[PDB]
Amino acid sequence: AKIYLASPFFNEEQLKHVSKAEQVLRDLGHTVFSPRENQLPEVEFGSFEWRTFVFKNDLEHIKWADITFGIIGDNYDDTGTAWELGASYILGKPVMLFSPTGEIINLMITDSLHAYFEDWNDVENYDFATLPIKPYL
Amino acid sequence: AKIYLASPFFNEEQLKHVSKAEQVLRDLGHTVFSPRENQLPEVEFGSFEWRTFVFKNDLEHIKWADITFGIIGDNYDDTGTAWELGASYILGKPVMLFSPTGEIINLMITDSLHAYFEDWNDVENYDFATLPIKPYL
Amino acid sequence: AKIYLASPFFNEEQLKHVSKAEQVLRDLGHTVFSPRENQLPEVEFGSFEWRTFVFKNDLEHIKWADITFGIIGDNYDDTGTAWELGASYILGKPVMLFSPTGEIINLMITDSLHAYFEDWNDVENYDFATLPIKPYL
Amino acid sequence: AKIYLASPFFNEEQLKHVSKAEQVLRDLGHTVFSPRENQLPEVEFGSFEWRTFVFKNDLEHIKWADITFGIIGDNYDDTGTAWELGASYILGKPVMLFSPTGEIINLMITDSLHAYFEDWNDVENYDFATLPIKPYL
Amino acid sequence: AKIYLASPFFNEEQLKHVSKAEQVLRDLGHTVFSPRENQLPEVEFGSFEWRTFVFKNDLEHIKWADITFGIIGDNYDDTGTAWELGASYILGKPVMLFSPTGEIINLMITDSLHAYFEDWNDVENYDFATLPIKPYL
Amino acid sequence: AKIYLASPFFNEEQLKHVSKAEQVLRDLGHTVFSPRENQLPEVEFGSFEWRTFVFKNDLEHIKWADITFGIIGDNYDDTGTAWELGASYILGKPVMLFSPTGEIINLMITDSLHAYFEDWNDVENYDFATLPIKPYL
């Protein structure tokens, strides 16, 4: 499948999780769009133009993807990821979530997920072809 | 206009801002759905029935609304609100955002909003009929 | 509210229920599109032109409506109505359903409705402005 | 392609048609989601929770599919299938319909189809890659 | 109704038709967003900021509108207008079209419109509340 | 990928560009739907029925496609193509545009594109798998 990796990527622990998710999913044969690899170094970093193109390229890759794969733990920086999960739900993309902390996530996110994971071995054995439901409970 | 009020309401400070938003928008004549008034009275709290009905009722009222009015502050509790603004954007609802702090906001949210406010008198003078653009700058 | 009245209208009993729905919803001040009043006067009945315009006009009026109000009974004629409720749900129109029989209804319909009624006085007291949830239980 | 099989599956004749459709389409190399194979025996059959998850998993597989393949004859149990065909149309999925009775189907269904079949040999020779229109007439 | 006025406004003749449309639709009591009044006062003309805000404000006002009212004439300048009618159609906005010339129109546009006009008195008598179909013939 | 080729095809220069686009994209392994190859010679050319089925089959192939690939130059016949680009944008399809004249195209089109090309060698080296943004500037 084509997967949009929705996760922050600004500190060491966030990068650990994104890096692993890139590795697990790509090693399964999936095409993963990971926003940290597309910083758009063609316009001025942080300009209005840069903000606009980052948004447009990320949103257009959520629409391009088959599945949105999110990562949310306790690094309370989840506002961009949360937005992209909500957008993905309305766009009709199956939403998957990996939580490293295994904590309690907001109702709107958990109720919208199609598959929820807390260990990478379960992602590695999940049937992306038939896409079985694995709800948060 | 019909307005969905997207905001956390889980501690005293968040409740203060929600209360002011309800009062301001309703005194302007708008019909406001405020999720805190719709915690359902009373399916057992936290049951599967309760989680389902709250999610479904909330989402249906985003769909019913003309405009989604969000409150984003210093909260690190903005996960569900951020999700509701992403859903709203895909659903084609104009997003208005109020920030009690005036801090920097994630670019997925700032690039998705139609009008941005940092004072309630600015909301009180906004032309809801014509919906002029009021971007985050 | 603008209301699309989804119901069969092909025998005397179905016509009775449609007529009562028209009267009740219109006496409440709502603007009701009733497909039986829009059989088009008169492109040749059953022509390709007639089939096209009726389909297009009906679907456009589901899109124009705020709410789709359906009548599901003992009809085994509910095919087009059921189709219109599925379309309505994806289009983000709140679905209200009235069942003259109170029998068991398919779970794709019951899990898609926002308000369920078995008596017209309950419809007469429903708050259309706030659209409270009234689930099938 | 990925195909959602929309059909009842509760009596012998309905099961005959679903079984054949599973067989024909899968033998062509398509990935078929057939709701009768996913009864969700992880929660209590018939509970509110079961109804909710069946709806969510079926709807999420319509969104996952490329094409919705319906079966409608004269076994007047078509209300769930009709709903899913209407949803599929608004979601933008090409809708295909196989009718064993070859009778007259409601306007909203026939006008929404992309391909209509009355014999399995025609499905077996249809070009799913180019998806030519084969309208009901 | 809220109406998005889709039309070029780049020479004297196009401006004449836009002006008459504004006057007619506003004298009927409608709330009209007219893109020529929203060239933004004044982000630098033609800047990236200006191109972004105009696009975003225009699209947001198509989403805000109940109806998109288009003017298609002898213009070979109808590119953006044609784009806005295609977007409108997918967004589920009923499309009304006025042609100052009465010439032949592309079938993607004629097969997407809900009401077609060649005289302003016909627009003045149109029932906007019920939105009757008025096809291009 | 599956690509919808949005372009006029009525004069020699338009046919040159469509023919080349068919050739380049298909030689890359993409499945291209080109409307000129599907004239529907099963009903009467130019009838109402023909106009209806051409629209339905073209729209249904835009929805079937992964990407919409447009061609717009100075052959001012772009009203159907413009419509299909606007529809494709709202449907969530990445929009690509090849311009032979390399001129100035309307704001709504250029701002909506994901990839813009003026030479076929660039299309031949573009990564359709990762779909990088190549904006008009």
Interface test with A, best of E44, E48, E57 (most A CBs within 10 A): E48
Closest to A88 in 3D by CA, of A72, A73, A105, A67:
A67
**For D47, nearest residue in chain B (alpha carbons):** B49
Q: Are B17 and B7 in contact (CB under 8 A)?
A: yes
Distance from CA of C79 to the nearest CA of F (A): 22
Judged by a CB distance cut-off of 8 A, whether residue A92 touches chain D is yes
Look at strands B67-71 and D95-98 and give their pairing.
unpaired
The answer, for B52 touching chain D at a CB cutoff of 8 Å, is: yes
Which residues from chain A sit within 8 angstroms of residue E48, using beta carbons? 48-49, 52
- Measured between CB atoms, does F55 come within 8 Å of chain C? no
Contacts of F58 in chain E (CB under 8 A): 108
Phi then psi dihedrals of residue A118, to 5 deg: -125, 0
Instruction: Return all residues near A83 (Cβ < 8 A) that are at least 6 apart.
Output: B82, B83, B85, B86, B89, B106, B108, B109, B112
A118 cis-preceded (ω within 30 degrees of 0): no
> CA–CA distance from D9 to each of A3, D19, D78, E81, F80 (Å)?
33, 9, 10, 48, 44
Task: Report the C-alpha gap between D99 and D108 in whole angstroms.
Answer: 15
Please state how this structure was obtained: X-ray
- Which residues in chain F touch residue D92, judged by CB atoms under 8 angstroms apart? 63, 91
Name which of C55, C90, C105 is nearest D111 (Cβ-Cβ).
C55
Q: Smallest CA–CA separation between A21 and chain F, in Å?
A: 17
CA distance A27 to A6: 18
Nearest Cα residue in chain C from D57: C108
* CB-nearest partner of C131 from B53, B61, B91: B61
For residue B24, the one-letter residue type is: V
What is the distance between the alpha carbons of residues E127 and F115, in angstroms, rounded to a whole number?
43
Is A87 in Cβ contact with B82 (below 8 Å)? no
Reported as type and span, the H/E element at residue A50 is helix A48-64
**Is the N-terminal amide bond of A103 cis, ω within 30° of 0?**
no
Which of D110, D114, D131 to mutate: most F Cβ within 10 Å?
Answer: D131
> For chain F, how many structural domains are there in total?
1
Q: How close E97 gets to chain B, by Cα (Å)?
A: 22
Partners of residue D106 in chain C, C-beta under 8 Å: 79-80, 83
Helix (H, G, I), strand (E, B) or coil at C7: coil
CA distance, residue B90 to nearest chain D CA (Å): 14
CA A30 to chain centre: 13
| CA–CA distance, F39 with F36 (Å, rounded to integer) | 6
User: Which residue of chain B is at minimal alpha-carbon distance from A47?
Assistant: B137
Alpha-carbon dihedral sign for residues C83, C88, C90, C94: negative
Which one, of C78, C80, C89, C90, lies nearest residue C98 by Cα?
C78
On whether the CB atoms of residues D4 and D38 are closer than 8 A, the answer is no
DSSP state of F84: H
Does the beta carbon of F1 lie under 8 angstroms from any beta carbon of chain D?
A: no
Between chains, do B92 and E63 touch, taking CB under 8 Å as contact?
yes
A104 touches chain D (CB under 8 A): no
D129 to F31: CB separation less than 8 angstroms, yes or no: yes
Q: Give the closest-approach CA distance of D57 to chain C in angstroms.
A: 11
Cα R_g (chain B), whole angstroms: 14
Closest-CA distance, F2 to chain D, in angstroms, reads: 9
CA quadruple D101, D107, D113, D116: dihedral, nearest 10: 30
State the Cα–Cα distance between residues A104 and A111, nearest whole angstrom. Answer: 12
In this structure, are residues D75 and D10 in contact, taking their beta carbons and an 8 Å threshold? no
In terms of residue numbers, what domain contains B99?
A: 1-137
Residues 6+ apart with CB under 8 A from C50: C40, C43, C44
Q: Of F65, F99, F103, F105, which Cα lies nearest the Cα of F84?
A: F65
- Contacts of E among chains (3+ CB pairs under 8 A): A, B, C, F
d(C-alpha A20, C-alpha B51), whole Å: 32
Whether E100 and E74 have beta carbons less than 8 Å apart is answered as yes
Q: Which residues touch D93 (CB under 8 Å, ≥6 apart)? A: D4, D62, D65, D66, D67, D68, F63
Which of E66, E94, E129 shows the shortest C-beta gap to C60? E94
**CB–CB of B133 and E57 under 8 A?**
yes
Whole-angstrom distance, CA of residue A102 vs CA of residue A89: 22
| DSSP label of E36 | G
Residue E41 burial (10 A CB sphere; 0-12, 13-18, 19+) = exposed
In the structure encoding, which two tokens stand for residue B38, read together?
């719709």
| Residue numbers preceding breaks in chain A (C to N > 2.5 A) | none
- As a whole number of angstroms, the distance between CA E122 and CA F101 comes to 41
- For residue D132, the chain F residues in CB contact (below 8 A) are 38
Q: What gap in Å lies between CA F60 and CA D114, rounded to an integer?
A: 8
Please tell me the distance in Å from E3's CA to the nearest CA on chain B. Answer: 11
Q: Is F110 on the interface with D (CB under 8 A)?
A: no
For F11, the 3-state DSSP assignment is coil
The 3-state DSSP class for residue C2 equals strand
- Mapping DSSP onto H, E and C, the string for chain D reads CEEEEECCCCCHHHHHHHHHHHHHHHHCCCEEECHHHCCCCCCCCCCHHHHHHHHHHHHHHHHHCCEEEEECCCCCCCHHHHHHHHHHHHCCCCEEEECCCCCCCCHHHHCCCCEEECCHHHHHCCCCCCCCCECCC
> Which of chain C's residues have a Cβ under 8 Å away from the Cβ of B39?
none
Backbone angles phi, psi at E119, to 5 degrees: -145, 145
What is the helix (H) or strand (E) element at residue C98, kind and residue range? strand C95-98
Probe site for chain B from D52, D54, D55, D91 (most B CB atoms < 10 A) = D52
Q: How far is A133 from chain D (nearest CA, A)?
A: 6
CB contact under 8 A, F82 and E87: no
How far does Cα C123 stand from its chain's mean position? 13
d(C-alpha D31, C-alpha B76), whole Å: 42
DSSP per position, C20-69: HHHHHHHHTT-EEE-GGG-S-SSSPTTSHHHHHHHHHHHHHHHHH-SEEE
**Comparing C-alpha atoms, which of A73, A117, A75 is closest to residue A97?**
A117
The Cα–Cα gap between B43 and B55 comes to: 13
Report residue C79: phi and psi, to 5°.
-65, -55
Tell the residue number behind the tokens 């109170």, with chain if given. C102
